[PDB]
Amino acid sequence: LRTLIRLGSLHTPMVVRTAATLRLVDHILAGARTVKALAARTDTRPEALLRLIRHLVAIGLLEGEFVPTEVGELLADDHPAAQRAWHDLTQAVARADISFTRLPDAIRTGRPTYESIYGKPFYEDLAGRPDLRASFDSLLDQAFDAPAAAYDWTNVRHVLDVGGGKGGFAAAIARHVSATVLEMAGTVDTARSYLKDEGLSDRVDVVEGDFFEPLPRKADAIILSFVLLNWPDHDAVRILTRCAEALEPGGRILIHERAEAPSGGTRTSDLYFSVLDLRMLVFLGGALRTREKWDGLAASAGLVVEEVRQLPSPTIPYDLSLLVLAPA
Amino acid sequence: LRTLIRLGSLHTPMVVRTAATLRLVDHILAGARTVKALAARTDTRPEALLRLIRHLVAIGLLEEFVPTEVGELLADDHPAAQRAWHDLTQAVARADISFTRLPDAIRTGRPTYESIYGKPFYEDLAGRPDLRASFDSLLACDQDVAFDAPAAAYDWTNVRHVLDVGGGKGGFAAAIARRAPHVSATVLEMAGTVDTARSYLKDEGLSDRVDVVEGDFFEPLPRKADAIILSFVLLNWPDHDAVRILTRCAEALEPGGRILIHESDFSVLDLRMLVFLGGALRTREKWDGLAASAGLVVEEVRQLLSLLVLAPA
Ligand SMILES: CC[C@@]1(O)C[C@H](O[C@H]2C[C@H](N(C)C)[C@H](O)[C@H](C)O2)c2c(cc3c(c2O)C(=O)c2c(O)cccc2C3=O)[C@H]1C(=O)OC
Ligand SMILES: CC[C@@]1(O)C[C@H](O[C@H]2C[C@H](N(C)C)[C@H](O)[C@H](C)O2)c2c(cc3c(c2O)C(=O)c2c(O)cccc2C3=O)[C@H]1C(=O)OC
Ligand SMILES: C[S@+](CC[C@H](N)C(=O)[O-])C[C@H]1O[C@@H](n2cnc3c(N)ncnc32)[C@H](O)[C@@H]1O
Ligand SMILES: C[S@+](CC[C@H](N)C(=O)[O-])C[C@H]1O[C@@H](n2cnc3c(N)ncnc32)[C@H](O)[C@@H]1O
């Protein structure tokens, strides 16, 4: 009974997320240990903040003066795992997680619930909210060293990174190759700034546009890193087809995502990837795909999976893959 | 890191609550172990139900899928009633969505339920007979035994009549009537609830000893009594409202009468009161002040939870 109640408790994660959002652990580490000072710094009502703190003590994140535990220290804004931002309700991902309150609808329909809560589908909501666009892009350790090392660039003149975020993958590849990042409004500006500040602006450019439209140029390698999981099969096939049509002769499409058999691993990795797969369902109608589902998606786009390079890791983000696709 | 991610995960409790809402474990126990059959019984999309099942396996509620010993606690007939307490169509798990706006409650000290559902808690139940009934059944889910200890924490020898103010389905009045055959009692409750209290007390064979009045415990109470009961009532109310209720009870005491308040690290219950109702759990010193504002004094406290016995000051 205690196990079930713990698994089912909605209050504990919302208390953690509220503490992250209020930056409570940052304020304590900066010398606000008392409720009166912490209530001033967080702009909260002191009696209610103490009731929040009581739960944070009960679950082991805090211990009239309060300090973080070793686990609570991970909510410090400068901790390398960045768990404060990933739990911050004002930033894109924990905000999107509220969509899980309508999880029954998503299981009933297979369709995302984010629009029903926030008024627009995911990327269109970000397009109207520059703060959320920027926090989404910053949330997504630019992590691309191993996938860049898993491909032979000898015969590659130009790389097109489709949906390439702030440009970290293109940069890892750059470190004879030139590259282009294709991205959405807003994101293109932070990609350009990142690439300039890496000293790579003469090797990597950035184009604003829509990867459902004809791609801006041809390339020898076209990258889809954590893109296709955001889309249902029919959209994923459209993106793959745009990429296929943009390949130079002998070119390849590189997919950087999860591509395992549905077995193996541990309950810990099972859980971690269950969360990602369910986030794609609820936020976007997308999904993680097994190695076998990749074969079918590829065939619908006129492609074949030529090779799957394993990118192992026993710790988060665990084992990933680089799939290499060629025209069929 | 793993501990923090587990504590912070909204996904797992919503997967549990979705399984409870879909009555998934009941359908498995009733023969549907495969996704095709379970999708049909739950009226869900099979590929998405499988993704839900994968999470339920990873967290150890399921393991052709069958419930684990923990998952079996989501059977609808299990006496701890955890399926209904996690059911998003019933009152409490529905109210728990208020926690998605917990930062607002911490900022203001005010409930977030009305901002989500359009009306404050008891007004919403008053317009939704299904939610009113499921709330009453959730709290009364063990009322045949849960009031034996508070009833035995008080001596009924010189009590003639009991008034249970906000008495739910009547379980406390019934436990007192079984403890003390000489007492009569009255339950005061809201619309809807009074009908299921009347039915419960009739089916206990107590209808000649316990009656039920529909009314509002912020108004003059319907009669006087030697013992007036407030069981898990005052925690629903901010201080000024709790004082009003206590004062109405004080006005209705017979000479020599007493008010009985029936009310681990509880932070969940306290935060639920904040977000649902603006209420709170109270420590002893706070009870002393509330009592004093209503013209009362705390005469004795019995550990059971507690039973506080209040007398006119
Ligand atoms: C923490 C691991 C990872 O960063 C992997 C994964 O993180 C990315 C970036 C990450 N970063 C260090 C650049 C790293 O390269 C990793 C291998 O890939 C990932 C994550 C999360 C999301 C997403 C992720 O791709 C999303 O794509 C995503 C999205 O496209 C739309 C909405 C939400 C999300 C995500 O929440 C993360 C994840 O799997 O969390 C369980
Ligand atoms: C699970 C423990 C408990 O049943 C204690 C507590 O439940 C106890 C006492 C309760 N009572 C009728 C004696 C009953 O016997 C139940 C099975 O166990 C409790 C609970 C929950 C509520 C409430 C609780 O009292 C409420 O009163 C309540 C309310 O008045 C209005 C809105 C919501 C609620 C509640 O959600 C529960 C709780 O503390 O959850 C954290
Ligand atoms: C940030 S995630 C993956 C980013 C990056 N490739 C990585 O691995 O971290 C998916 C990206 O697809 C982009 N995107 C979504 N729809 C798009 C579209 N129609 N055209 C171009 N980019 C799009 C989003 O802006 C987002 O940055
Ligand atoms: C169910 S909880 C506690 C019930 C019961 N005494 C117990 O211990 O389980 C609080 C009760 O207060 C009742 N209540 C709320 N506002 C009321 C009001 N103004 N007048 C009478 N009853 C009210 C609700 O209907 C609800 O049943």
Author numbering:
A (entry chain B): 17 to 79, 84 to 160, 163 to 164, 167 to 199, 203 to 355
B (entry chain A): 17 to 79, 85 to 284, 296 to 297, 300 to 338, 347 to 355
Can I see the authors' text?
Tailoring steps catalyzed by SAM methyltransferase-like proteins have yielded particular insight into evolution of anthracyclines and generation of structural diversity. DnrK is a canonical S-adenosyl-L-methionine (SAM)-dependent methyltransferase that catalyzes 4-O-methylation in daunorubicin biosynthesis. Recent studies have uncovered that DnrK is bifunctional and catalyzes additional 10-decarboxylation as a moonlighting activity. Here we have taken advantage of the natural diversity of anthracycline methyltransferases and employed extensive chimeragenesis to probe factors that govern catalysis and substrate recognition.
Next, we introduced R1 from the 10-decarboxylase TamK, creating DnrK TDDD. The region is reminiscent to CalMB in terms of length, but contains a Tyr residue instead of His at the key junction. Activity assays confirmed the importance of R1 in determination of reaction chemistry, since the 10-decarboxylation activity of DnrK TDDD increased with all substrates, particularly with 5 (35%), in comparison to DnrK RDDD and DnrK CDDD. Structural determination of DnrK TDDD was carried out to explore the significant gain of decarboxylation observed by this chimera. The structure revealed that insertion of three additional residues in R1 extends the α16 helix by one additional half-turn in comparison to DnrK and DnrK DDDD S298 (31). However, the longer helix protrudes away from the active site towards bulk solvent and is unlikely to have a significant influence in catalysis. The positioning of Q296 in DnrK allows access for solvent ions to reach the active site through an open channel, which is blocked by F297 in DnrK DDDD S298. DnrK TDDD harbors Y299 in the structurally equivalent position, but the solvent channel remains open due to an additional interaction of Y299 with the ligand; a hydrogen bond between the tyrosine and the carbonyl oxygen of the substrate rotates the side chain of Y299 in a manner that prevents channel closure. The residue Y299 is fully conserved in 10-decarboxylating enzymes and mutation of that residue, in TamK, into aromatic phenylalanine or histidine revealed the formation of hydroxylated products 9 and 10. It seems likely that the aforementioned interaction of Y299 with the substrate is required to prevent closing of the channel, and the disruption of the hydrogen bond may lead to a rotation of the functional group into a position that favors hydroxylation.
